[PDB]
Each structure stands twice: as C-alpha cells, then as structure tokens.
C-alpha cells in the first residue's frame, strides 16, 4: 500500500528525506545513466546513417 | 581551473607548511608526468617503483632518477663517457 | 553420468563389466502437443552410468526386446 503510494509520488516531500541528494541517488550514477544513453543514441544514429563519421565525433565529444 | 597554485598537493590540505608542499609538488608532477619512450617514440613511460620507468606498450624498462626518467647528472655522465670513449 | 548415443548402446549392453540396467518411464509434455512416453535405458557398469533417452513407444518396444537376456533389468 506504501510501495503503490510511493509509485504515484506520495511520501516524497521535503520532510520524508533524511539522506542527501548524492546519497539517495549519486550524481555519478545519474551522469553514467545520461552519458550511456547519449553514447548509444549517437551509436544508433551513425550506424543507421542519419549522421556520418565527422558529425558523430564532434557531437560524441560535446555529449 | 579549480586551485590557484596548490595543484596536485591539494590532497595534503593545509598541513605540512607551504614551502614543503611546493618542494614535494615540483617532484610529484615530474614522477606522475609521461615521457618519450626513446625506443617507441610514443609519449607514455609509466614510472613504477622509484628509479624504474617502464614503456606502456613496447615492454622496455629503463633505470632513471627517483622523480624524472633522465636526471641532469645522468645526462652529464652519458655526454662525458661518449666524449672520452672516442680515445 | 554420460548420455550416449544412440548408438554405442548395443555394445554397452555387451561390455561384460555391466550386470544391471534400468527402464524409467516419465510421461513428459511437449508444448501440450500430447503427453508421450519418454523412456530412459540406464546402463550401470562400472565407473559411469550411461543413459539412452528414447521419445517413442515404438523404438522403446523394439530395443527393450533387443536388451540382452544376459543382463538384469530394473523396470522402475
């Protein structure tokens, strides 16, 4: 009943949060999620032939 | 850039005094830099076990200074030996 | 244990260091195709146990009859 209540986004306010951001969800693991997402998109886009080698590389290093 | 002047010796916080932190830094940079594998040409020679400088990928270990691959005394001796070898 | 082959089984029966075999019948279901027999002829002798898995009652019949009279056979 609490696990369903926490899915719908209750019990998540400022007074139910005794850990820091970097403890609850480490900024590193957030960055790793995001980069692996952007890396695999640029991989799919270059192999599908949406972009070529030269745009891939500059947007790889900018990502 | 994060630290003004402290650089690598930021890991020693405020302890040990400015002048000792600068004196250790000058050599902490040298021992952790990469040098030119004079066999390979490639700029990667792994310092490992002070006095030993291995090549990253041609497996060739040279014997060097504690903090630099070739010291000023070892440059002088190699030059002077080359000089007085010719007789 | 090893699972062999067929063949080799007609020579395992006559290896002369084997005394005992076993018939195990496991009514097994293939994607609800229908419940078939699944017979297993196990040859105990000497340093290993040899399993022959047969999936039809026809060949089960045929080389149950082919199993030698110079052998003990424990059915279940």
């Amino acid at each position: 009943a609490h696990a369903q209540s926490k899915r719908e986004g209750r019990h998540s306010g400022y007074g139910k949060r005794k850990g820091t951001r970097e403890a609850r969800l480490p900024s590193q693991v957030v960055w790793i999620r995001r980069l692996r997402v952007l890396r695999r998109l640029l991989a799919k886009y270059r192999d599908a032939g949406k972009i070529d080698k030269h745009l891939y590389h500059v947007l790889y290093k900018e990502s | 850039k994060r630290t003004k002047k402290v650089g690598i010796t930021g890991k020693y916080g405020v302890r040990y005094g400015s002048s000792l932190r600068r004196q250790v830094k000058k050599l902490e940079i040298q021992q952790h830099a990469r040098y030119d594998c004079s066999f390979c040409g490639k700029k990667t020679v792994k310092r490992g076990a002070a006095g030993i400088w291995t090549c990253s990928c041609c497996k060739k270990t040279v014997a060097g200074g504690a903090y630099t691959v070739s010291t000023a005394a070892a440059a002088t001796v190699r030059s002077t030996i080359r000089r007085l070898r010719e007789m | 244990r090893e699972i062999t082959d067929i063949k080799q089984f007609l020579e395992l029966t006559r290896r002369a260091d084997v005394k005992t075999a076993t018939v195990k019948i496991n009514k097994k279901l293939n994607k609800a195709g229908k419940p078939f027999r699944q017979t297993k002829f196990k040859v105990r002798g000497s340093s290993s146990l040899y399993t022959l898995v047969i999936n039809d009652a026809g060949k089960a019949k045929k080389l149950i009859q082919s199993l030698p009279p110079t052998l003990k056979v424990n059915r279940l």
Binding site: - | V24, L27, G51, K60, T61, V62, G65, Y67, A74 | -
Partner: protein
C-alpha cells in the same frame, strides 16, 4: 625493499657447463631491459659495462667499485652516487679515485667498477613527508625508527 636504487637482474652464461648463471646488479642510470652489459678488461667504455679501473681512462664516472680485486662491489652502491677515477699509476699498478664522501682513496688497477651513475638519484631531495612515510621507509630496512631523545 629498504634500498632506493633499482636492481638489474642480468642473465650471463656459464663458460664451463651448459647454464645461464643469473646475477643481480645495481642498475646504473640509462641501463634498460634486453640491452647487452659487457663485463671484462676488453669490454667497451659504455654505461652498464664492468671493466677494471686500470683498463679505463682518467675522468670516468664509475660505480659499484671493488675495494680489493675480487670483492664483487663495495663503493658507490647507493642511489645517485658514483666514484670519479682521478689518477693512475701502472708502476705499482694502483689508481687514485674520489669517493661520494669527497675522500681520495688508492685502489688496485684490477679492482672492477660499473660505468655511469647508480639510478634512482634525487630520491633524498623530496621531503619524506608526514611521519607515516618515514615509518613505511624504515619498516623494510630496520627497527631504528621513532628515536626517543636521551
């Protein structure tokens, strides 16, 4: 461990039986892996080579020198240290040498020595740092550490 100068394990042969008698040296600076070390009177004057002080010209920077001939190394054995062969005399074959301490000695001409400086030099010029560095330095040489004042 307890010594701040690399050791060059250098494989030689056995002239009399079929072996490879492996010998443990103190690597001179510029010595590298697979390179050929030459030990004897007729050996060339290159870094790493082991020739008697008599078979060498004046002004050479030698190391791992013998006090007596047949000693097998005694002098200038530590990090970044070397002997300078000052003088000579074939008449009563005894050569003058200047030791890392700045003392002038007179050794036999048959006493050997390795050419160049011993590697690992400048090891002392970095501050050791925060006690624990000293602790770990000593822990593999001897039990002469944290000295109480009498």
């Amino acid at each position: 461990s307890g010594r701040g100068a690399p050791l060059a394990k250098v494989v030689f042969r056995d002239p009399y039986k079929y072996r490879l008698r492996e010998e443990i040296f103190i690597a001179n600076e510029g010595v590298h892996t697979g390179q050929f070390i030459y030990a004897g009177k007729k050996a060339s004057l290159n870094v790493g080579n082991v020739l008697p002080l008599g078979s060498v010209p004046e002004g050479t920077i030698v190391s791992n020198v013998e006090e007596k001939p047949g000693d097998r190394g005694a002098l200038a054995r530590a990090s970044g240290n070397y002997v300078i062969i000052i003088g000579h005399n074939p008449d009563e074959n005894k050569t003058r040498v200047r030791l890392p301490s700045g003392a002038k000695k007179v050794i036999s001409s048959d006493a050997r020595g390795v050419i160049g400086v011993i590697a690992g030099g400048g090891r002392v010029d970095k501050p050791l740092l925060k006690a624990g560095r000293a602790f770990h330095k000593y822990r593999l040489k001897r039990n002469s550490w944290p000295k109480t004042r009498g």
